[PDB]
Design an enzyme around this catalytic site. Sequence first.
Site, PDB file in Angstrom:
ATOM      1  N   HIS A  78       0.807  -1.209   0.000  1.00 23.95           N
ATOM      2  CA  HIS A  78       0.000   0.000   0.000  1.00 23.95           C
ATOM      3  C   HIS A  78       0.853   1.278   0.000  1.00 23.95           C
ATOM      4  O   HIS A  78       0.882   2.052   0.960  1.00 23.95           O
ATOM      5  CB  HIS A  78      -1.005  -0.028   1.147  1.00 23.95           C
ATOM      6  CG  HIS A  78      -1.959  -1.176   1.063  1.00 23.95           C
ATOM      7  ND1 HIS A  78      -1.758  -2.362   1.735  1.00 23.95           N
ATOM      8  CD2 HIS A  78      -3.097  -1.338   0.351  1.00 23.95           C
ATOM      9  CE1 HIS A  78      -2.740  -3.198   1.457  1.00 23.95           C
ATOM     10  NE2 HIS A  78      -3.567  -2.601   0.621  1.00 23.95           N
ATOM     11  N   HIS A  82       1.388   1.396  -5.691  1.00 20.59           N
ATOM     12  CA  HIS A  82       0.034   0.870  -5.767  1.00 20.59           C
ATOM     13  C   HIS A  82      -0.924   2.002  -6.141  1.00 20.59           C
ATOM     14  O   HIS A  82      -1.724   1.862  -7.068  1.00 20.59           O
ATOM     15  CB  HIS A  82      -0.385   0.165  -4.468  1.00 20.59           C
ATOM     16  CG  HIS A  82      -1.862  -0.112  -4.374  1.00 20.59           C
ATOM     17  ND1 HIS A  82      -2.513  -0.996  -5.207  1.00 20.59           N
ATOM     18  CD2 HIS A  82      -2.814   0.395  -3.553  1.00 20.59           C
ATOM     19  CE1 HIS A  82      -3.799  -1.021  -4.905  1.00 20.59           C
ATOM     20  NE2 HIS A  82      -4.009  -0.181  -3.907  1.00 20.59           N
ATOM     21  N   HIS A 118      -6.592   7.020  -2.647  1.00 22.84           N
ATOM     22  CA  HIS A 118      -7.432   6.018  -1.999  1.00 22.84           C
ATOM     23  C   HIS A 118      -6.730   5.191  -0.928  1.00 22.84           C
ATOM     24  O   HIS A 118      -7.384   4.488  -0.161  1.00 22.84           O
ATOM     25  CB  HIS A 118      -8.068   5.091  -3.048  1.00 22.84           C
ATOM     26  CG  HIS A 118      -7.177   3.962  -3.477  1.00 22.84           C
ATOM     27  ND1 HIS A 118      -6.152   4.126  -4.381  1.00 22.84           N
ATOM     28  CD2 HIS A 118      -7.148   2.662  -3.109  1.00 22.84           C
ATOM     29  CE1 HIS A 118      -5.531   2.976  -4.554  1.00 22.84           C
ATOM     30  NE2 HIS A 118      -6.116   2.070  -3.795  1.00 22.84           N
ATOM     31  N   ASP A 119      -5.409   5.261  -0.864  1.00 19.02           N
ATOM     32  CA  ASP A 119      -4.679   4.507   0.149  1.00 19.02           C
ATOM     33  C   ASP A 119      -3.641   5.353   0.858  1.00 19.02           C
ATOM     34  O   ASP A 119      -2.772   4.825   1.551  1.00 19.02           O
ATOM     35  CB  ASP A 119      -3.972   3.325  -0.491  1.00 19.02           C
ATOM     36  CG  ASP A 119      -4.836   2.113  -0.555  1.00 19.02           C
ATOM     37  OD1 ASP A 119      -5.720   2.013   0.309  1.00 19.02           O
ATOM     38  OD2 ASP A 119      -4.627   1.266  -1.450  1.00 19.02           O
ATOM     39  N   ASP A 236      -8.566  -1.287  -7.997  1.00 17.26           N
ATOM     40  CA  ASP A 236      -7.933  -1.670  -6.754  1.00 17.26           C
ATOM     41  C   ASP A 236      -7.580  -3.159  -6.740  1.00 17.26           C
ATOM     42  O   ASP A 236      -6.521  -3.546  -6.245  1.00 17.26           O
ATOM     43  CB  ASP A 236      -8.808  -1.315  -5.552  1.00 17.26           C
ATOM     44  CG  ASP A 236      -7.986  -1.009  -4.329  1.00 17.26           C
ATOM     45  OD1 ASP A 236      -6.740  -0.941  -4.480  1.00 17.26           O
ATOM     46  OD2 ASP A 236      -8.567  -0.827  -3.232  1.00 17.26           O
ATOM     47  N   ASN A 239      -4.668  -6.368  -9.974  1.00 16.74           N
ATOM     48  CA  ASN A 239      -3.382  -7.059 -10.036  1.00 16.74           C
ATOM     49  C   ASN A 239      -3.447  -8.448 -10.671  1.00 16.74           C
ATOM     50  O   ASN A 239      -2.611  -8.786 -11.504  1.00 16.74           O
ATOM     51  CB  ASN A 239      -2.731  -7.129  -8.647  1.00 16.74           C
ATOM     52  CG  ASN A 239      -2.909  -5.849  -7.861  1.00 16.74           C
ATOM     53  OD1 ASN A 239      -3.999  -5.576  -7.342  1.00 16.74           O
ATOM     54  ND2 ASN A 239      -1.856  -5.045  -7.778  1.00 16.74           N
ATOM     55  N   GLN A 287      -4.049 -17.141  -3.305  1.00 17.67           N
ATOM     56  CA  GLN A 287      -4.308 -16.433  -4.553  1.00 17.67           C
ATOM     57  C   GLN A 287      -5.436 -17.073  -5.343  1.00 17.67           C
ATOM     58  O   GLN A 287      -6.196 -16.374  -6.011  1.00 17.67           O
ATOM     59  CB  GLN A 287      -3.045 -16.289  -5.415  1.00 17.67           C
ATOM     60  CG  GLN A 287      -2.086 -15.224  -4.917  1.00 17.67           C
ATOM     61  CD  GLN A 287      -2.781 -13.902  -4.589  1.00 17.67           C
ATOM     62  OE1 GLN A 287      -3.377 -13.270  -5.458  1.00 17.67           O
ATOM     63  NE2 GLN A 287      -2.703 -13.487  -3.329  1.00 17.67           N
TER      64      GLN A 287
HETATM   65  C1  J25 Z   1      -3.816 -13.881   0.228  1.00 15.73           C
HETATM   66  C2  J25 Z   1      -4.489 -13.083  -0.867  1.00 15.73           C
HETATM   67  O1  J25 Z   1      -4.782 -11.790  -0.348  1.00 15.73           O
HETATM   68  C3  J25 Z   1      -4.877 -10.657  -1.245  1.00 15.73           C
HETATM   69  O2  J25 Z   1      -4.237 -10.654  -2.290  1.00 15.73           O
HETATM   70  C4  J25 Z   1      -5.794  -9.548  -0.869  1.00 15.73           C
HETATM   71  C5  J25 Z   1      -5.830  -8.174  -1.480  1.00 15.73           C
HETATM   72  N1  J25 Z   1      -4.970  -7.735  -2.443  1.00 15.73           N
HETATM   73  C6  J25 Z   1      -5.256  -6.804  -3.361  1.00 15.73           C
HETATM   74  O3  J25 Z   1      -5.388  -5.612  -3.099  1.00 15.73           O
HETATM   75  C7  J25 Z   1      -5.389  -7.310  -4.786  1.00 15.73           C
HETATM   76  C8  J25 Z   1      -4.403  -8.431  -5.049  1.00 15.73           C
HETATM   77  C9  J25 Z   1      -4.506  -9.689  -5.632  1.00 15.73           C
HETATM   78  C10 J25 Z   1      -3.286 -10.384  -5.643  1.00 15.73           C
HETATM   79  C11 J25 Z   1      -2.182  -9.739  -5.086  1.00 15.73           C
HETATM   80  S1  J25 Z   1      -2.766  -8.200  -4.547  1.00 15.73           S
HETATM   81  S2  J25 Z   1      -7.064  -7.196  -0.746  1.00 15.73           S
HETATM   82  C12 J25 Z   1      -7.612  -8.454   0.330  1.00 15.73           C
HETATM   83  C13 J25 Z   1      -6.850  -9.705   0.186  1.00 15.73           C
HETATM   84  C14 J25 Z   1      -7.232 -10.858   1.065  1.00 15.73           C
HETATM   85  C15 J25 Z   1      -8.753 -10.817   1.285  1.00 15.73           C
HETATM   86  N2  J25 Z   1      -9.340  -9.515   1.674  1.00 15.73           N
HETATM   87  C16 J25 Z   1     -10.484  -9.531   2.369  1.00 15.73           C
HETATM   88  O4  J25 Z   1     -11.413 -10.233   1.986  1.00 15.73           O
HETATM   89  O5  J25 Z   1     -10.691  -8.718   3.579  1.00 15.73           O
HETATM   90  C17 J25 Z   1      -9.653  -7.947   4.200  1.00 15.73           C
HETATM   91  C18 J25 Z   1     -10.234  -6.731   4.896  1.00 15.73           C
HETATM   92  C19 J25 Z   1      -8.751  -8.223   1.272  1.00 15.73           C
HETATM   93 ZN    ZN Z   2      -5.767  -0.060  -2.642  1.00 11.45          ZN
HETATM   94 ZN    ZN Z   3      -7.465   0.443   0.633  1.00 10.32          ZN
END
Ligand code: J25
Ligand code: ZN
Ligand code: ZN
Length: 328
Positions: A78, A82, A118-119, A236, A239, A287
């Site tokens: 973040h 990003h 946003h972040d 957001d 990726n 993932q």
């Molecule tokens: C282990 C996988 O976790 C994440 O990639 C991941 C995010 N990543 C991203 O912003 C997009 C991406 C995809 C791949 C790399 S970055 S946001 C998020 C997760 C886990 C579940 N979450 C959720 O549901 O609640 C959290 C408040 C929120």
């Molecule tokens: Zn973000």
């Molecule tokens: Zn955010």
Amino acid sequence: GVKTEQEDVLAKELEDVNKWGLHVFRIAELSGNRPLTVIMHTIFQERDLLKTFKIPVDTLITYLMTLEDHYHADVAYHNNIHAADVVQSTHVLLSTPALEAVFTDLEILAAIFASAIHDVDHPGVSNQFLINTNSELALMYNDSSVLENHHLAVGFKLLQEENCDIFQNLTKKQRQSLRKMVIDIVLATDMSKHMNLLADLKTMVETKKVTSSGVLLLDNYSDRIQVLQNMVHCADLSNPTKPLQLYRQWTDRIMEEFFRQGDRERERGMEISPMCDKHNASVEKSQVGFIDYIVHPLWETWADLVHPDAQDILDTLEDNREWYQSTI
Ligand SMILES: CCOC(=O)c1c(NC(=O)Cc2cccs2)sc2c1CCN(C(=O)OCC)C2
Ligand SMILES: [Zn+2]
Ligand SMILES: [Zn+2]
């Protein structure tokens, strides 16, 4: 009066701004870690936003610089890179043919400005972390969308620093509209709003309406802002729809963050958060989990709304998805 070779190499990279999968990390490197400023500025020039909104360029740069410097460079995911990526992705989403000539300049400025901030000032830990640790931020915002309220408050507060008010020439009306919209968009970046955002989006798709040369018809704020919220939300979480080369660095960075967060949780007694557990975490499973349950349904739904605009994007995501499955 001529660019340095670096400025030039940097400009060419920027020639890719209208394209999904720009190499934002190179740009981060080439620009001396100003990917947010140069991309924003490029986008702003490219959409003619300075003229349209009488934004002085020096003010634009000062704010941009100030804003970028309020993302944390010591945060793996973040950060300003990003930020820049979400900006550029939103940029690209706005250009989708299904949306041609749908949104006004103010709505575009909101979507893009929202993405830029946003972040901002993200600590690299999650809302829940902040809540459970009884942190000032959590107490400030009564435990509700803690981070996202903070990103907004900061993004807007930064407009008051010296020669930073990029909106100094907008009328009160423009400014109030912009502000509300930007707030609705950044608030919708909270993951706990995901399921509802999607629901509405599916509903939009279901009760779809198009008009002349076939671009979404949206004759009320609720619909307009919902598409924008989903758009920036899609960016957001874009990726996994990027070339694997990009996708993987992003996963590296997010995992570094979760692991670092899990590190603070493990010691401070708390039970290591979901997927944050070091050594006990399968990145590849996480993932797939994330793609199947969150990211794919969002993009599939978004893809419908804009069919066939997002096909290559959705396909990339599925390729990337299967890939991680190889890693099993
Ligand atoms: C282990 C996988 O976790 C994440 O990639 C991941 C995010 N990543 C991203 O912003 C997009 C991406 C995809 C791949 C790399 S970055 S946001 C998020 C997760 C886990 C579940 N979450 C959720 O549901 O609640 C959290 C408040 C929120
Ligand atoms: Zn973000
Ligand atoms: Zn955010």
